[PDB]
Design a protein around this nucleic acid. Sequence first.
RNA 1: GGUUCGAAGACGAUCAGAUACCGUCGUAGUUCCGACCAUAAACGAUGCCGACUGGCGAUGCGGCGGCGUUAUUCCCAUGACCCGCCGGGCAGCUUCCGGGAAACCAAAGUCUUUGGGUUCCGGGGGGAGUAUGGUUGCAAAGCUGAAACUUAAAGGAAUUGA
Lengths: 71, 129, 221, 217, 101, 132, 83, 25
Amino acid sequence: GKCRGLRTARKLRSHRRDQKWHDKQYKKAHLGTALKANPFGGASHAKGIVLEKVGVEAKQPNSAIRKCVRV
Amino acid sequence: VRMNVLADALKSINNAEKRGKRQVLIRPCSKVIVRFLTVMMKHGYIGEFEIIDDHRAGKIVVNLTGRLNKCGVISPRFDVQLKDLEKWQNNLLPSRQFGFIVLTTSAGIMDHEEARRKHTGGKILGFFF
Amino acid sequence: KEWLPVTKLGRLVKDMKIKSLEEIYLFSLPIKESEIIDFFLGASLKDEVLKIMPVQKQTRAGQRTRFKAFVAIGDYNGHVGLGVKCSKEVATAIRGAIILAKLSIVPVRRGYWGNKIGKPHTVPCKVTGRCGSVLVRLIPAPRGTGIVSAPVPKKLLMMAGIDDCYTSARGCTATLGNFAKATFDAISKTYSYLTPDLWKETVFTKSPYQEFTDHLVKTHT
Amino acid sequence: SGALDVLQMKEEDVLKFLAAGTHLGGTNLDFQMEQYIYKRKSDGIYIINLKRTWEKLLLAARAIVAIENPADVSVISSRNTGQRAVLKFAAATGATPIAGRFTPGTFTNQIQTAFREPRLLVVTDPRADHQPLTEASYVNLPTIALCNTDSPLRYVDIAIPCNNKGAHSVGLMWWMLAREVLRMRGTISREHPWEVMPDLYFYRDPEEIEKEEQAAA
Amino acid sequence: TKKRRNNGRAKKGRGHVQPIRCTNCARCVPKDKAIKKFVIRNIVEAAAVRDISEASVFDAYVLPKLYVKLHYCVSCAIHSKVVRNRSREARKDRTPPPRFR
Amino acid sequence: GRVRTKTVKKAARVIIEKYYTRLGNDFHTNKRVCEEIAIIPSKKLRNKIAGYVTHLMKRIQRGPVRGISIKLQEEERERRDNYVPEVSALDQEIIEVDPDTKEMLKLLDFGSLSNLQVTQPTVGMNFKTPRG
Amino acid sequence: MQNDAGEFVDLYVPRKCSASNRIIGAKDHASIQMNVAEVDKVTGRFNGQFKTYAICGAIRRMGESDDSILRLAKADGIVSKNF
Amino acid sequence: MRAKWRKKRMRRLKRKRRKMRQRSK
RNA sequence: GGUUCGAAGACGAUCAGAUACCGUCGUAGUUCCGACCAUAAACGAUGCCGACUGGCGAUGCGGCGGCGUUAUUCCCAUGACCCGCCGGGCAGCUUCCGGGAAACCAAAGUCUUUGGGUUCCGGGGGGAGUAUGGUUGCAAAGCUGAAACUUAAAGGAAUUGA
Ligand SMILES: [Mg+2]
Ligand SMILES: [Mg+2]
Ligand SMILES: [Mg+2]
Ligand SMILES: [Mg+2]
Ligand SMILES: [Mg+2]
Ligand SMILES: [Mg+2]
Ligand SMILES: [Mg+2]
Ligand SMILES: [Mg+2]
Ligand SMILES: [Mg+2]
Ligand SMILES: [Zn+2]
């Protein structure tokens, strides 16, 4: 840090506390909006129901019709 | 303004050492600085220094050899026990063979070796090697 | 095959006037020929190839691609060198890099961690070395610790003979050349780092030139 | 040299110093050579301390004499002012001279034809001969240089304060240097004056040469 | 890349100077930044001088001079070849060019 | 354009420095000399070499040359470059000494000088070049 | 250099500058080991011994080598005290 | 796309949004 | 108060097309007084206070010391000069102090040998300084200020070609 005073513990803790939010990984983890946006709700696996089969085109020059399922 | 007289006094001495000056003059003199210089002198890292005092804060002229690589200062003066003294010297000294962390104690200003053999801690002042 | 000396030091070392290599390092004499190194420490001189980096410069005729070879050489006791050279073919690049590494071989100082029993094992002091951006810090370690380091400088330290050492790497260590030269600098300035046991007033010994001056003007022009 | 009447300056040396004008310093002054100057005259010409100049010349003579082989002493002068003085000095003391045009790489590049590695170097003017000094950084050999008040003191070991601008001064300093190094060894006694006059080392202008030939003819 | 230590101007302790309009164009440039030329020129340059002096009523009459202080913008001066670009090492020198003619 | 190339000039220089005794100012003589000495397959090149050799020989016999290093240089210094006047220029009856130089001489142990002359001090401290 | 057993343990002892009191690296090519001869007090000739000084490269490139040589020579008596 | 002109365009877009919000208030 | 200039606008040229670049007029404005507005490449793209670490030529202020010129004229003393020192003020020139990726920097150094005190501020590029909320304002707008989503690059210095 830069303010290394003898009794600046609260200043340092507050600065660290409100500057960790700028890290998008920490903010995404600790904000419920990202967890709500995640379809699984912070779950590794989830059961779904098949609706249709979709052939999606690939990216730039590597191009192919990949197979996907609307679940 | 000037907050720590000890800090810039050591920094001026270190700069003179890096530039290889024969002797260095530090403008302010304090009891802490005099004890610090005596501690280094008794370990042979400096020469024979004089104190030139008017009826104000005096000056100190210190004769310098080439043995001192760096005379650092730690700010603020943290409180160190004998449990964490080994960690402090591990993170602040080149090796376990040499280097001295001078920290003022109940007995007075003395290095970590003398602090250990008297079994007492205190405020950390600085380091030199 | 036989070596004909060109330099003043080379004549003396061929005539065996200087028995050991450390005299040259003592007097800071520049070693300009590679026949001194293998004469002195060729018994246990081992070489490894670090990286072949194909640098290119672009002209109207596309790019003139030539290969740059990094060579790490040295014996496992106290002496190591690093060679860098770029040539248009791999074989010549290696042959030119190894001789540069031999010319650039530098002695190292080994110390003790805590207790000083037996032979030295680790770096005497916390020493840093940096070229460009990469910074490599060497920390003393107790006996049997090993070389806790990245693979690239681990082999250099093993060749340096320091079998116990902690390292800290700062910066873009992906660049092999910067990484190699940074740790080479770190292990080369150990003998230039002042140590309290070196406080003894050294006595200036006899320089090889002033000690064999008659021989120099007698055995050659 | 040190409080020895044998090596003390003589009145004839003072007369030759004044006649050559070696005490005349330059217009400017380098911060590394302010200790060789007594006072600055009106018109802003510095004065070179002759006694300290002589003592420094003695020290340089001691360094040259300390070398065993006389051949491995290299004397350099690229400027024509001391072009023949530097050549005849080495011819007298057995040194190996370079008569101007110090080609770069003569100390570092071993493949070069003029590859020499002398024990000690004596250069005339550092400002005009920076290249020998820079090469002396790569090859460990001490350096003795004749430095005026405007000459920097980088990579030089012994600097003799003298007026390197004047041809007479340069010739006198080299002639005195040759005399001193020959006295310090078993070559010439210190009682009688040296046979060769100092004017032998003085720079001869081609106009001066044809002037002399015209007078003779 | 800071091309110049002083950015094409002599502003060191002001932060703002009065702009001045260009001569050929109407562009305004800071006073220290603009290229300034002070051209002195006779009314007659090369050939007209001899005949006008011959035809003058007064004998040995000295011709007058016109004093013009031209201010050019950077683009205008370079287009008019008042100044030319130089190498990176040759930018730093600022001595005026020789004036033998 | 009649310019000798590097091959002609370099070959002429080394030939002269190796056979300075056998060469002179006569073009035709050294033409046969260089023919016998060096193997030049082309006679036109031989004439070019001989021509430049003669020109360099004239330069050598008239004075020094940078690119030729025969033994003549080693002895030319001790024959006519050893000129010394009968009286040295440093031997003068009176020497002009400024008051400040006289003062530093008084500081030195050389207090009494028989053949000096203290000049009048210069008046007016005007020595710096005007700016611009 | 001494270990606990009392054996000199380093391969060689690097030189130390007589002016800067700093050790000289094995590749500090700017370092100088200079020898100054002494002169007999009554004979005025070379004796046969030397007074040797060491100057580090840092002092040389800084530009204080001549002053360091002058001070050491004066300390060792080569130069007169009056100077 | 110059930063100044896209800043001006987004400023107009904000003005239009503000007016639409005001009229729909 | 509106001289000149000149957004918007009109017209004449250029142009394949010019709603512009060029030219003629030309409203607001550009001027002043009284209220707001508080935004700039508001730049040294470089926080404030304090100590140390090379020289060299200068410059502005005042003080100090000093040969010698030139005025008041009739000389002490005041100016204009000249030669140095002193404190900071804009700066410049050179360097293997040292730094950094380099450009370059006596600070952008005294940073792994990491700590003089202290405020603000950045965490890949966009989305966006956008939405919403609050607040200020006559308005234009200012301050505070996200997310969903998308991408494996965006970027800095420097070298060679073109
Ligand atoms: Mg892709
Ligand atoms: Mg502004
Ligand atoms: Mg139209
Ligand atoms: Mg256009
Ligand atoms: Mg109009
Ligand atoms: Mg307005
Ligand atoms: Mg802003
Ligand atoms: Mg830090
Ligand atoms: Mg981001
Ligand atoms: Zn313009």
